[PDB]
């Protein structure tokens, strides 16, 4: 039975709420999930022989949240290649602007630039018109969790 590192990138907690639901769903299906609200390469590392998943957002001029910048730089510069990494991605932000989920999209790109192999398609939550993001992400995690071991 699989184990899932559930790495988070936020400055306001809305993507973190979805990550806590994602951990609960995978745990209920039977997989040993673990959510990380303040992650590091040291917590990403234990899952390269396994599976991982991302729940992230956007900040500044369209940059990654500072809570996941040290994970994004760490994997980019001190890991470099991941041909056997398997995962899934949820991204969350405001639809009112051109950088729609651009910080979460950069974290999916962190893994495709390293030859990882996602077990699904990236979910894009529009918080400014979607005040119940659980309803946009729970059936997505329940589905993705059937594609594990
Ligand atoms: C400076 C700034 C600009 C933002 N502009 C965007 C944007 O262009 N695209 C987007 O998807 N999210 C954007 N966001 C994210 C919003 O804050 C959004 O309301 C989000 O849901 C906040 O919750 P989160 O951090 O948990 O995701 C921006 C955040 C900040 C700090």
Tab-separated table of N, CA and C and ligand atoms in Angstrom:
chain	number	residue	atom	x	y	z
A	1	UNK	N	0.852	-1.225	0.000
A	1	UNK	CA	0.000	0.000	0.000
A	1	UNK	C	0.877	1.261	0.000
A	2	UNK	N	0.612	2.216	-0.898
A	2	UNK	CA	1.449	3.399	-1.123
A	2	UNK	C	1.530	4.376	0.077
A	3	UNK	N	2.489	5.303	-0.004
A	3	UNK	CA	2.716	6.398	0.950
A	3	UNK	C	2.900	7.705	0.157
A	4	UNK	N	2.240	8.802	0.561
A	4	UNK	CA	2.162	10.049	-0.232
A	4	UNK	C	2.623	11.262	0.572
A	5	UNK	N	3.696	11.910	0.123
A	5	UNK	CA	4.088	13.209	0.662
A	5	UNK	C	3.229	14.286	-0.013
A	6	UNK	N	2.564	15.133	0.773
A	6	UNK	CA	1.583	16.121	0.298
A	6	UNK	C	2.106	17.511	0.658
A	7	UNK	N	2.848	18.091	-0.276
A	7	UNK	CA	3.622	19.312	-0.073
A	7	UNK	C	2.782	20.543	-0.420
A	8	UNK	N	2.879	21.582	0.417
A	8	UNK	CA	1.985	22.745	0.361
A	8	UNK	C	2.746	24.049	0.139
A	9	UNK	N	2.122	24.961	-0.615
A	9	UNK	CA	2.643	26.302	-0.885
A	9	UNK	C	1.549	27.354	-0.759
A	10	UNK	N	1.559	28.114	0.336
A	10	UNK	CA	0.533	29.124	0.662
A	10	UNK	C	1.076	30.281	1.505
A	11	UNK	N	0.314	31.375	1.552
A	11	UNK	CA	0.513	32.526	2.451
A	11	UNK	C	-0.784	32.916	3.199
A	12	UNK	N	-1.885	32.168	2.987
A	12	UNK	CA	-3.224	32.462	3.536
A	12	UNK	C	-4.009	31.220	4.019
A	13	UNK	N	-3.557	29.998	3.697
A	13	UNK	CA	-4.104	28.744	4.244
A	13	UNK	C	-5.197	28.059	3.409
A	14	UNK	N	-5.606	28.618	2.266
A	14	UNK	CA	-6.719	28.078	1.470
A	14	UNK	C	-6.313	26.802	0.719
A	15	UNK	N	-5.118	26.783	0.119
A	15	UNK	CA	-4.530	25.551	-0.443
A	15	UNK	C	-4.156	24.540	0.646
A	16	UNK	N	-3.732	24.993	1.833
A	16	UNK	CA	-3.466	24.101	2.973
A	16	UNK	C	-4.723	23.345	3.436
A	17	UNK	N	-5.891	23.994	3.488
A	17	UNK	CA	-7.166	23.327	3.787
A	17	UNK	C	-7.442	22.169	2.812
A	18	UNK	N	-7.226	22.394	1.511
A	18	UNK	CA	-7.340	21.345	0.492
A	18	UNK	C	-6.309	20.227	0.706
A	19	UNK	N	-5.079	20.557	1.105
A	19	UNK	CA	-4.052	19.567	1.421
A	19	UNK	C	-4.386	18.698	2.651
A	20	UNK	N	-4.983	19.271	3.699
A	20	UNK	CA	-5.489	18.518	4.856
A	20	UNK	C	-6.621	17.548	4.459
A	21	UNK	N	-7.561	17.976	3.608
A	21	UNK	CA	-8.563	17.081	3.008
A	21	UNK	C	-7.924	15.986	2.141
A	22	UNK	N	-6.916	16.316	1.327
A	22	UNK	CA	-6.200	15.340	0.510
A	22	UNK	C	-5.518	14.251	1.357
A	23	UNK	N	-4.843	14.639	2.445
A	23	UNK	CA	-4.270	13.700	3.413
A	23	UNK	C	-5.345	12.781	4.012
A	24	UNK	N	-6.466	13.344	4.476
A	24	UNK	CA	-7.581	12.587	5.042
A	24	UNK	C	-8.178	11.572	4.047
A	25	UNK	N	-8.410	11.963	2.789
A	25	UNK	CA	-8.918	11.085	1.727
A	25	UNK	C	-7.987	9.899	1.455
A	26	UNK	N	-6.685	10.144	1.310
A	26	UNK	CA	-5.715	9.098	0.980
A	26	UNK	C	-5.554	8.144	2.167
A	27	UNK	N	-5.541	8.704	3.376
A	27	UNK	CA	-5.576	7.967	4.645
A	27	UNK	C	-6.821	7.077	4.760
A	28	UNK	N	-8.007	7.588	4.405
A	28	UNK	CA	-9.270	6.840	4.427
A	28	UNK	C	-9.299	5.698	3.393
A	29	UNK	N	-8.732	5.923	2.200
A	29	UNK	CA	-8.544	4.887	1.172
A	29	UNK	C	-7.503	3.820	1.577
A	30	UNK	N	-6.562	4.171	2.464
A	30	UNK	CA	-5.622	3.258	3.132
A	30	UNK	C	-4.140	3.613	2.947
A	31	UNK	N	-3.831	4.601	2.103
A	31	UNK	CA	-2.465	5.046	1.797
A	31	UNK	C	-1.897	5.893	2.940
A	32	UNK	N	-0.616	5.704	3.285
A	32	UNK	CA	0.069	6.468	4.348
A	32	UNK	C	0.445	7.874	3.857
A	33	UNK	N	-0.531	8.775	3.792
A	33	UNK	CA	-0.309	10.165	3.398
A	33	UNK	C	0.334	10.983	4.538
A	34	UNK	N	0.995	12.093	4.203
A	34	UNK	CA	1.537	13.056	5.176
A	34	UNK	C	1.588	14.447	4.552
A	35	UNK	N	0.849	15.403	5.117
A	35	UNK	CA	0.857	16.809	4.678
A	35	UNK	C	2.024	17.605	5.289
A	36	UNK	N	2.571	18.547	4.514
A	36	UNK	CA	3.718	19.388	4.877
A	36	UNK	C	3.433	20.869	4.565
A	37	UNK	N	3.021	21.640	5.579
A	37	UNK	CA	2.708	23.078	5.460
A	37	UNK	C	3.942	24.001	5.321
A	38	UNK	N	5.135	23.510	5.682
A	38	UNK	CA	6.421	24.225	5.608
A	38	UNK	C	7.541	23.245	5.164
A	39	UNK	N	7.477	22.734	3.918
A	39	UNK	CA	8.323	21.640	3.432
A	39	UNK	C	9.786	22.025	3.129
A	40	UNK	N	10.610	20.996	2.915
A	40	UNK	CA	12.034	21.062	2.552
A	40	UNK	C	12.405	19.838	1.687
A	41	UNK	N	13.506	19.899	0.923
A	41	UNK	CA	14.036	18.747	0.164
A	41	UNK	C	14.188	17.500	1.062
A	42	UNK	N	14.608	17.688	2.318
A	42	UNK	CA	14.713	16.639	3.351
A	42	UNK	C	13.407	15.865	3.624
A	43	UNK	N	12.245	16.466	3.346
A	43	UNK	CA	10.916	15.847	3.453
A	43	UNK	C	10.368	15.366	2.097
A	44	UNK	N	10.836	15.940	0.982
A	44	UNK	CA	10.561	15.441	-0.372
A	44	UNK	C	11.306	14.127	-0.686
A	45	UNK	N	12.562	14.016	-0.237
A	45	UNK	CA	13.483	12.898	-0.470
A	45	UNK	C	12.921	11.489	-0.150
A	46	UNK	N	12.273	11.226	1.008
A	46	UNK	CA	11.762	9.898	1.385
A	46	UNK	C	10.751	9.221	0.434
A	47	UNK	N	10.302	9.899	-0.630
A	47	UNK	CA	9.204	9.466	-1.500
A	47	UNK	C	9.592	9.255	-2.978
A	48	UNK	N	10.864	9.411	-3.376
A	48	UNK	CA	11.296	9.175	-4.770
A	48	UNK	C	11.139	7.702	-5.214
A	49	UNK	N	11.219	6.751	-4.276
A	49	UNK	CA	10.910	5.324	-4.496
A	49	UNK	C	9.394	5.008	-4.400
A	50	UNK	N	8.558	6.045	-4.238
A	50	UNK	CA	7.124	5.981	-3.901
A	50	UNK	C	6.328	6.962	-4.786
A	51	UNK	N	5.437	7.758	-4.187
A	51	UNK	CA	4.629	8.788	-4.841
A	51	UNK	C	4.541	10.055	-3.972
A	52	UNK	N	4.215	11.177	-4.605
A	52	UNK	CA	4.111	12.520	-3.998
A	52	UNK	C	2.928	13.283	-4.591
A	53	UNK	N	2.540	14.412	-4.007
A	53	UNK	CA	1.471	15.264	-4.529
A	53	UNK	C	1.619	16.695	-3.997
A	54	UNK	N	1.148	17.652	-4.790
A	54	UNK	CA	1.378	19.086	-4.598
A	54	UNK	C	0.050	19.822	-4.439
A	55	UNK	N	-0.031	20.750	-3.484
A	55	UNK	CA	-1.187	21.645	-3.271
A	55	UNK	C	-0.644	23.063	-3.042
A	56	UNK	N	-0.587	23.875	-4.101
A	56	UNK	CA	0.145	25.170	-4.104
A	56	UNK	C	-0.654	26.332	-4.702
A	57	UNK	N	-0.152	27.556	-4.534
A	57	UNK	CA	-0.797	28.802	-4.972
A	57	UNK	C	0.195	29.787	-5.608
A	58	UNK	N	-0.126	31.085	-5.664
A	58	UNK	CA	0.650	32.143	-6.365
A	58	UNK	C	0.772	33.407	-5.489
A	59	UNK	N	1.843	34.200	-5.652
A	59	UNK	CA	2.107	35.440	-4.889
A	59	UNK	C	2.909	36.456	-5.718
A	60	UNK	N	3.289	37.592	-5.125
A	60	UNK	CA	4.064	38.669	-5.754
A	60	UNK	C	3.582	39.060	-7.159
A	61	UNK	N	4.522	39.164	-8.104
A	61	UNK	CA	4.257	39.423	-9.529
A	61	UNK	C	3.863	38.144	-10.316
A	62	UNK	N	3.414	37.078	-9.633
A	62	UNK	CA	3.140	35.753	-10.224
A	62	UNK	C	4.114	34.640	-9.799
A	63	UNK	N	4.882	34.861	-8.734
A	63	UNK	CA	5.900	33.955	-8.190
A	63	UNK	C	5.288	32.836	-7.320
A	64	UNK	N	6.095	31.842	-6.944
A	64	UNK	CA	5.719	30.831	-5.950
A	64	UNK	C	5.627	31.452	-4.531
A	65	UNK	N	4.677	31.008	-3.680
A	65	UNK	CA	4.597	31.345	-2.258
A	65	UNK	C	5.917	31.110	-1.532
A	66	UNK	N	6.322	32.033	-0.658
A	66	UNK	CA	7.623	31.915	0.010
A	66	UNK	C	7.745	30.651	0.887
A	67	UNK	N	6.611	30.111	1.347
A	67	UNK	CA	6.496	28.823	2.049
A	67	UNK	C	6.942	27.597	1.228
A	68	UNK	N	7.040	27.702	-0.110
A	68	UNK	CA	7.478	26.610	-1.009
A	68	UNK	C	8.668	26.983	-1.906
A	69	UNK	N	9.063	28.259	-1.973
A	69	UNK	CA	10.319	28.696	-2.623
A	69	UNK	C	11.537	27.845	-2.211
A	70	UNK	N	11.823	27.566	-0.917
A	70	UNK	CA	12.974	26.735	-0.544
A	70	UNK	C	12.845	25.254	-0.945
A	71	UNK	N	11.634	24.767	-1.254
A	71	UNK	CA	11.420	23.415	-1.786
A	71	UNK	C	11.675	23.411	-3.297
A	72	UNK	N	11.164	24.433	-3.986
A	72	UNK	CA	11.320	24.637	-5.417
A	72	UNK	C	12.797	24.861	-5.796
A	73	UNK	N	13.522	25.764	-5.115
A	73	UNK	CA	14.972	25.933	-5.327
A	73	UNK	C	15.765	24.660	-4.978
A	74	UNK	N	15.416	23.983	-3.874
A	74	UNK	CA	16.107	22.777	-3.409
A	74	UNK	C	16.027	21.625	-4.411
A	75	UNK	N	14.827	21.296	-4.901
A	75	UNK	CA	14.644	20.251	-5.920
A	75	UNK	C	15.308	20.658	-7.248
A	76	UNK	N	15.214	21.935	-7.637
A	76	UNK	CA	15.773	22.449	-8.900
A	76	UNK	C	17.311	22.400	-8.957
A	77	UNK	N	17.988	22.655	-7.832
A	77	UNK	CA	19.447	22.858	-7.775
A	77	UNK	C	20.227	21.756	-7.030
A	78	UNK	N	19.566	20.971	-6.170
A	78	UNK	CA	20.189	19.931	-5.323
A	78	UNK	C	19.553	18.537	-5.482
A	79	UNK	N	18.691	18.353	-6.493
A	79	UNK	CA	18.115	17.064	-6.903
A	79	UNK	C	18.278	16.866	-8.427
A	80	UNK	N	17.858	17.853	-9.231
A	80	UNK	CA	18.126	17.971	-10.675
A	80	UNK	C	17.466	16.982	-11.654
A	81	UNK	N	17.155	15.741	-11.259
A	81	UNK	CA	16.605	14.708	-12.160
A	81	UNK	C	15.755	13.672	-11.399
A	82	UNK	N	14.591	13.299	-11.951
A	82	UNK	CA	13.549	12.499	-11.281
A	82	UNK	C	12.713	11.631	-12.264
A	83	UNK	N	13.336	10.753	-13.082
A	83	UNK	CA	12.660	10.007	-14.160
A	83	UNK	C	11.564	9.024	-13.696
A	84	UNK	N	11.581	8.649	-12.413
A	84	UNK	CA	10.694	7.665	-11.777
A	84	UNK	C	9.731	8.285	-10.736
A	85	UNK	N	9.793	9.603	-10.526
A	85	UNK	CA	8.897	10.347	-9.637
A	85	UNK	C	7.484	10.361	-10.241
A	86	UNK	N	6.474	9.895	-9.498
A	86	UNK	CA	5.059	9.868	-9.908
A	86	UNK	C	4.233	10.665	-8.913
A	87	UNK	N	3.281	11.439	-9.433
A	87	UNK	CA	2.588	12.437	-8.619
A	87	UNK	C	1.244	12.933	-9.169
A	88	UNK	N	0.741	14.014	-8.578
A	88	UNK	CA	-0.448	14.770	-8.965
A	88	UNK	C	-0.367	16.190	-8.393
A	89	UNK	N	-1.140	17.133	-8.945
A	89	UNK	CA	-1.052	18.558	-8.572
A	89	UNK	C	-2.418	19.220	-8.505
A	90	UNK	N	-2.600	19.991	-7.445
A	90	UNK	CA	-3.711	20.910	-7.248
A	90	UNK	C	-3.081	22.299	-7.110
A	91	UNK	N	-3.594	23.272	-7.854
A	91	UNK	CA	-3.195	24.666	-7.756
A	91	UNK	C	-4.418	25.548	-7.480
A	92	UNK	N	-4.213	26.626	-6.727
A	92	UNK	CA	-5.292	27.455	-6.191
A	92	UNK	C	-4.914	28.935	-6.235
A	93	UNK	N	-5.828	29.777	-6.702
A	93	UNK	CA	-5.601	31.213	-6.768
A	93	UNK	C	-6.799	32.001	-7.282
A	94	UNK	N	-6.549	33.258	-7.627
A	94	UNK	CA	-7.555	34.218	-8.074
A	94	UNK	C	-7.585	34.309	-9.613
A	95	UNK	N	-8.730	33.964	-10.211
A	95	UNK	CA	-9.002	34.025	-11.659
A	95	UNK	C	-8.986	35.438	-12.271
A	96	UNK	N	-8.935	36.496	-11.454
A	96	UNK	CA	-9.030	37.900	-11.908
A	96	UNK	C	-7.807	38.423	-12.686
A	97	UNK	N	-6.708	37.658	-12.749
A	97	UNK	CA	-5.407	38.103	-13.268
A	97	UNK	C	-4.708	37.052	-14.152
A	98	UNK	N	-3.765	37.516	-14.984
A	98	UNK	CA	-3.099	36.724	-16.043
A	98	UNK	C	-2.282	35.545	-15.493
A	99	UNK	N	-1.657	35.688	-14.317
A	99	UNK	CA	-0.886	34.627	-13.645
A	99	UNK	C	-1.775	33.566	-12.966
A	100	UNK	N	-2.937	33.217	-13.523
A	100	UNK	CA	-3.846	32.242	-12.912
A	100	UNK	C	-3.140	30.905	-12.618
A	101	UNK	N	-3.011	30.599	-11.324
A	101	UNK	CA	-2.241	29.493	-10.746
A	101	UNK	C	-0.762	29.391	-11.176
A	102	UNK	N	-0.115	30.487	-11.587
A	102	UNK	CA	1.261	30.457	-12.115
A	102	UNK	C	2.296	29.917	-11.113
A	103	UNK	N	2.093	30.101	-9.806
A	103	UNK	CA	2.994	29.560	-8.778
A	103	UNK	C	2.886	28.033	-8.639
A	104	UNK	N	1.671	27.480	-8.736
A	104	UNK	CA	1.444	26.026	-8.777
A	104	UNK	C	1.909	25.389	-10.092
A	105	UNK	N	1.667	26.062	-11.229
A	105	UNK	CA	2.168	25.646	-12.556
A	105	UNK	C	3.696	25.551	-12.613
A	106	UNK	N	4.404	26.502	-11.995
A	106	UNK	CA	5.865	26.422	-11.828
A	106	UNK	C	6.290	25.192	-11.007
A	107	UNK	N	5.544	24.809	-9.961
A	107	UNK	CA	5.846	23.583	-9.213
A	107	UNK	C	5.553	22.289	-10.009
A	108	UNK	N	4.563	22.254	-10.911
A	108	UNK	CA	4.422	21.113	-11.842
A	108	UNK	C	5.594	21.077	-12.846
A	109	UNK	N	5.970	22.239	-13.396
A	109	UNK	CA	7.141	22.387	-14.262
A	109	UNK	C	8.467	21.952	-13.596
A	110	UNK	N	8.649	22.174	-12.284
A	110	UNK	CA	9.791	21.687	-11.480
A	110	UNK	C	10.047	20.181	-11.653
A	111	UNK	N	8.992	19.411	-11.933
A	111	UNK	CA	9.024	17.952	-11.987
A	111	UNK	C	9.032	17.447	-13.436
A	112	UNK	N	8.280	18.075	-14.343
A	112	UNK	CA	8.359	17.761	-15.782
A	112	UNK	C	9.701	18.159	-16.419
A	113	UNK	N	10.329	19.253	-15.973
A	113	UNK	CA	11.712	19.609	-16.346
A	113	UNK	C	12.744	18.569	-15.848
A	114	UNK	N	12.334	17.677	-14.932
A	114	UNK	CA	13.143	16.585	-14.378
A	114	UNK	C	12.651	15.192	-14.819
A	115	UNK	N	11.721	15.111	-15.784
A	115	UNK	CA	11.241	13.864	-16.410
A	115	UNK	C	10.341	13.000	-15.507
A	116	UNK	N	9.766	13.581	-14.447
A	116	UNK	CA	8.725	12.938	-13.639
A	116	UNK	C	7.498	12.538	-14.489
A	117	UNK	N	6.608	11.688	-13.962
A	117	UNK	CA	5.517	11.085	-14.723
A	117	UNK	C	4.214	11.137	-13.918
A	118	UNK	N	3.472	12.240	-14.063
A	118	UNK	CA	2.239	12.490	-13.303
A	118	UNK	C	1.168	11.431	-13.610
A	119	UNK	N	0.407	11.044	-12.584
A	119	UNK	CA	-0.675	10.034	-12.647
A	119	UNK	C	-2.054	10.717	-12.771
A	120	UNK	N	-2.110	11.850	-13.477
A	120	UNK	CA	-3.311	12.683	-13.620
A	120	UNK	C	-3.040	14.040	-14.272
A	121	UNK	N	-4.026	14.934	-14.204
A	121	UNK	CA	-3.983	16.298	-14.758
A	121	UNK	C	-4.181	17.347	-13.650
A	122	UNK	N	-3.470	18.475	-13.764
A	122	UNK	CA	-3.399	19.513	-12.732
A	122	UNK	C	-4.744	20.231	-12.543
A	123	UNK	N	-5.249	20.246	-11.306
A	123	UNK	CA	-6.513	20.891	-10.939
A	123	UNK	C	-6.282	22.390	-10.681
A	124	UNK	N	-7.130	23.273	-11.227
A	124	UNK	CA	-6.953	24.738	-11.186
A	124	UNK	C	-8.161	25.437	-10.526
A	125	UNK	N	-8.021	25.760	-9.238
A	125	UNK	CA	-9.064	26.364	-8.386
A	125	UNK	C	-9.027	27.905	-8.443
A	126	UNK	N	-10.207	28.506	-8.593
A	126	UNK	CA	-10.512	29.919	-8.842
A	126	UNK	C	-11.240	30.556	-7.644
A	127	UNK	N	-10.522	30.673	-6.524
A	127	UNK	CA	-11.027	31.041	-5.200
A	127	UNK	C	-11.987	32.251	-5.150
A	128	UNK	N	-11.727	33.294	-5.947
A	128	UNK	CA	-12.538	34.527	-6.023
A	128	UNK	C	-13.987	34.320	-6.503
A	129	UNK	N	-14.279	33.166	-7.104
A	129	UNK	CA	-15.604	32.754	-7.589
A	129	UNK	C	-15.939	31.295	-7.188
A	130	UNK	N	-15.148	30.714	-6.275
A	130	UNK	CA	-15.198	29.313	-5.851
A	130	UNK	C	-14.872	29.186	-4.341
A	131	UNK	N	-15.758	29.677	-3.445
A	131	UNK	CA	-15.516	29.789	-1.999
A	131	UNK	C	-15.605	28.455	-1.224
A	132	UNK	N	-15.745	27.329	-1.931
A	132	UNK	CA	-15.880	25.967	-1.384
A	132	UNK	C	-14.915	24.986	-2.094
A	133	UNK	N	-13.585	25.244	-2.050
A	133	UNK	CA	-12.570	24.536	-2.845
A	133	UNK	C	-12.484	23.031	-2.560
A	134	UNK	N	-12.948	22.592	-1.388
A	134	UNK	CA	-13.147	21.180	-1.036
A	134	UNK	C	-13.958	20.449	-2.121
A	135	UNK	N	-15.035	21.069	-2.615
A	135	UNK	CA	-15.911	20.498	-3.659
A	135	UNK	C	-15.237	20.392	-5.035
A	136	UNK	N	-14.145	21.130	-5.248
A	136	UNK	CA	-13.361	21.147	-6.490
A	136	UNK	C	-12.160	20.185	-6.440
A	137	UNK	N	-11.826	19.658	-5.253
A	137	UNK	CA	-10.588	18.909	-5.002
A	137	UNK	C	-10.783	17.545	-4.342
A	138	UNK	N	-11.793	17.356	-3.497
A	138	UNK	CA	-12.054	16.060	-2.869
A	138	UNK	C	-12.281	14.911	-3.877
A	139	UNK	N	-13.200	15.010	-4.866
A	139	UNK	CA	-13.386	13.937	-5.848
A	139	UNK	C	-12.157	13.739	-6.749
A	140	UNK	N	-11.380	14.801	-7.005
A	140	UNK	CA	-10.090	14.717	-7.700
A	140	UNK	C	-9.081	13.850	-6.927
A	141	UNK	N	-8.905	14.079	-5.614
A	141	UNK	CA	-7.993	13.261	-4.790
A	141	UNK	C	-8.538	11.841	-4.636
A	142	UNK	N	-9.853	11.674	-4.436
A	142	UNK	CA	-10.465	10.343	-4.342
A	142	UNK	C	-10.211	9.521	-5.617
A	143	UNK	N	-10.365	10.127	-6.802
A	143	UNK	CA	-10.019	9.514	-8.088
A	143	UNK	C	-8.519	9.202	-8.208
A	144	UNK	N	-7.638	10.195	-8.033
A	144	UNK	CA	-6.179	10.022	-8.121
A	144	UNK	C	-5.665	8.926	-7.168
A	145	UNK	N	-6.249	8.828	-5.970
A	145	UNK	CA	-5.946	7.790	-4.986
A	145	UNK	C	-6.298	6.357	-5.417
A	146	UNK	N	-7.191	6.160	-6.401
A	146	UNK	CA	-7.425	4.833	-7.020
A	146	UNK	C	-6.299	4.404	-7.973
A	147	UNK	N	-5.463	5.348	-8.430
A	147	UNK	CA	-4.399	5.122	-9.418
A	147	UNK	C	-3.043	4.770	-8.764
A	148	UNK	N	-2.975	4.834	-7.428
A	148	UNK	CA	-1.874	4.339	-6.595
A	148	UNK	C	-1.833	2.786	-6.575
A	149	UNK	N	-0.951	2.208	-5.740
A	149	UNK	CA	-0.762	0.755	-5.531
A	149	UNK	C	-2.068	-0.050	-5.424
B	1	LIG	C1	0.550	39.744	-4.641
B	1	LIG	C2	-0.466	38.645	-4.876
B	1	LIG	C3	-1.055	38.559	-6.130
B	1	LIG	C4	-1.900	37.504	-6.441
B	1	LIG	N1	-2.376	37.420	-7.787
B	1	LIG	C5	-2.787	36.126	-8.215
B	1	LIG	C6	-2.782	35.743	-9.630
B	1	LIG	O1	-2.460	36.435	-10.572
B	1	LIG	N2	-3.126	34.488	-9.888
B	1	LIG	C7	-3.508	33.605	-8.995
B	1	LIG	O2	-3.827	32.515	-9.390
B	1	LIG	N3	-3.512	33.939	-7.676
B	1	LIG	C8	-3.130	35.141	-7.230
B	1	LIG	N4	-2.967	35.401	-5.884
B	1	LIG	C9	-3.523	34.467	-4.856
B	1	LIG	C10	-4.677	35.119	-4.034
B	1	LIG	O3	-4.181	35.664	-2.800
B	1	LIG	C11	-5.858	34.140	-3.738
B	1	LIG	O4	-6.917	34.861	-3.084
B	1	LIG	C12	-5.524	32.845	-2.926
B	1	LIG	O5	-6.722	32.058	-2.933
B	1	LIG	C13	-5.122	33.055	-1.441
B	1	LIG	O6	-5.079	31.761	-0.751
B	1	LIG	P1	-3.822	30.790	-0.876
B	1	LIG	O7	-2.563	31.477	-0.578
B	1	LIG	O8	-4.050	29.764	0.160
B	1	LIG	O9	-3.857	30.155	-2.192
B	1	LIG	C14	-2.192	36.496	-5.499
B	1	LIG	C15	-1.590	36.601	-4.238
B	1	LIG	C16	-0.733	37.657	-3.922
B	1	LIG	C17	-0.038	37.676	-2.571
